[PDB]
Ligand SMILES: Nc1ncnc2c1ncn2[C@@H]1O[C@H](CSCC[C@H](N)C(=O)O)[C@@H](O)[C@H]1O
């Protein structure tokens with residue numbers, strides 16, 4: 001009965017996450033800095049790094065390598081470092097282990113005393129032993145709600161609650177996000193070693209409380225309506241569609257700490273809210289290729305969002321009809337954005353959290 | 357890759373088709389539980405690590421893991437973290453594992469609130485866990501799988517088991533691969549275990565007389581494959597290509613790395629037993645006379661464990677519906693053959709307890 005989002009499209013995520021990779025780039029610096037100074041476990045005990053919301057692992061390679069290189073300047077070369085990559089049970093962990101084995105950038109190919117493991121359990125519960133994680137990393141994951149909130153009204157535009165006209169929808173989604181954030185922090189608070197550090201990068205609202213991706217939103221809503229207009233999509237199926245993604249404002253991120261600055265042994269050591277450079281727009285300004293612009297934006301939306309949309313269909317998710325819906329939606333969104341390229345706001349928040 | 361590897365179990369059916377395996381490993385659980393009573397445990401915030409080498413879907417791991425956890429909780433505080441590290445090949449269905457751990461009431465996650473689960477998708481013929489971190493190792497029905505079809509090995513004329521091959525060169529090539537694999541497995545477990553740690557192994561064996569067993573199954577499988585060629589469902593070139601890289605080890609093969617002084621890479625054999633598991637499908641048939649059920653049980657067993665590796669030899673994709681068709685028909689053919697003449701079979705196993713210095 002509890003409706004959850006779908007994981008990323010395993011087949012395309014590694015090729016369609018350049019936006020995410022570019023946006024998280026500043027957080028890597030914070031993560032490296034944290035690795036330079038974090039208190040370390042005693043003796044030859046393995047140093048554990050956790051990666052919360054790994055997907056295919058492609059975008060984890062750079063942050064993990066940065067942390068590992070920093071740690072190696074502090075510990076013996078034979079000392080074990082274990083990376084625990086976490087996601088939901090239905091994530092494609094085979095794609096992860098293939099990434100870790102095949103990609104030359106994989107830390108397994110650069111450090112002979114680094115190890116990899118996977119945890120397929122929602123990070124809104126405790127999923128690692130208490131007091132074991134020296135360094136935590138989570139990028140582009142916590143914006144995903146644990147669920148479509150119980151009793152929340154159907155989203156008439158489907159793809160983002162920030163653009164909904166229903167006040168009841170916004171408040172339900174907002175409450176779910178606050179609970180999820182409290183849960184995330186409580187359990188990371190137990191998992192981290194005393195003195196441990198967790199770096200979080202997530203979708204944010206900007207200074208003016210805006211979600212961003214305005215033209216994407218428009219293109220996506222219109223592309224969905226076109227499929228019901230062309231009879232390719234059923235009105236009942238479209239009505240069911242909702243993306244459980246919530247961007248948080250600065251005050252939303254500070255909410256669990258506000259009492260006096262601490263929550264379950266954790267404190268915000270650093271917080272930044274910024275707009276990521278729109279690389280797809282920048283490239284378009286350089287080469288003038290409109291189709292490429294549309295395809296890059298559409299690919300980003302497909303790998304991250306379309307499986308969650310596809311789950312609302314009457315057929316199975318491994319049905320030929322679902323594949324056709326995915327490919328058509330992508331093509332339509334590509335066409336709409338290519339026909340009038342516009343820059344987009346990509347509001348992010350980076351946090352460094354410390355355990356006392 | 358020119359290195360040809362076996363295929364993992366059929367995720368869709370393994371948990372329903374692994375009762376033979378579960379019944380066979382039962383005696384090894386006693387050994388595992390006993391080891392759990394005394395193995396050294398790591399200090400400080402480190403969790404106790406139990407490693408499960410060759411997890412598949414996780415269905416058969418639940419009982420052995422719980423036995424160890426229960427034993428550990430008689431020694432240490434309830435709030436001490438225990439981490440179970442389930443290991444398999446990268447192409448194993450780890451989603452099916454995590455669903456098993458979440459959904460099966462027998463899961464240790466449902467019986468012990470300070471137990472944790474992780475997965476490692478890297479061949480256990482390399483070191484896959486940090487040195488000295490594993491207190492307790494478990495591996496059931498996994499080590500009989502070769503790391504590869506040996507390079508330059510002749511084609512197996514009967515396809516499903518080298519022990520039944522009439523080709524001297526093929527038997528030698530497979531035996532050598534099995535021997536180096538065993539050395540590798542031991543070398544890396546010897547690194548992963550803490551000093552004083554224990555590893556319990558359960559694998560396919562040759563019996564007292566050097567026999568592989570499953571003779572009626574072997575006959576049914578060979579005949580069924582030939583039937584698929586004869587009936588135009590399988591190409592001769594596809595069948596020629598089929599080989600199951602499974603090797604059963606004799607007592608002497610298992611002891612080989614350790615002879616004559618008893619130690620290899622810091623490990624020793626503390627206990628070894630060679631035995632034939634009770635044939636439960638035969639026992640059931642003797643009780644109820646249901647020949648169809650007999651055939652289906654045996655065929656499902658063969659299907660979940662062996663058929664993905666056979667299907668890998670087909671000209672179509674393994675995601676192609678024709679592969680699914682091949683799987684289904686081979687199972688029905690084997691089921692019918694055995695149903696028509698039910699016979700008891702030998703299921704030769706070896707259980708080992710290995711100890712690190
Ligand atoms: N409750 C939860 N527990 C664990 N993972 C979750 C989750 N909710 C969403 N995710 C995962 O978060 C990921 C978002 S994609 C982000 C991937 C990568 N960190 C990057 O920066 O590109 C998906 O794999 C999704 O399955």
Ligand SMILES: Nc1ncnc2c1ncn2[C@@H]1O[C@H](CSCC[C@H](N)C(=O)O)[C@@H](O)[C@H]1O
Pocket residue numbers: 363364365374377378381409410411412413416417443444445448478479480481495496497498499501502503
């Ligand atoms: N080199 C290797 N590394 C890790 N796992 C392997 C392997 N070769 C085979 N396996 C795994 O061994 C398993 C055999 S099935 C045994 C499952 C379970 N332990 C039980 O007792 O029923 C399969 O999942 C297979 O993928």
Ligand SMILES: CCCCCCC[C@H](O)CC(=O)O
Pocket residue numbers: 020140141143159160203212213214216217245304305
């Ligand atoms: C307006 C719709 C744009 C939403 C874009 C959503 C981006 C995803 O969160 C990225 C991810 O999960 O890796």
Ligand SMILES: CCCCCCC[C@H](O)CC(=O)O
Pocket residue numbers: 377497500516517560569570571573574602661662
């Ligand atoms: C005659 C061939 C019968 C072989 C039966 C092989 C059984 C598999 O090893 C079981 C498994 O991998 O779990």
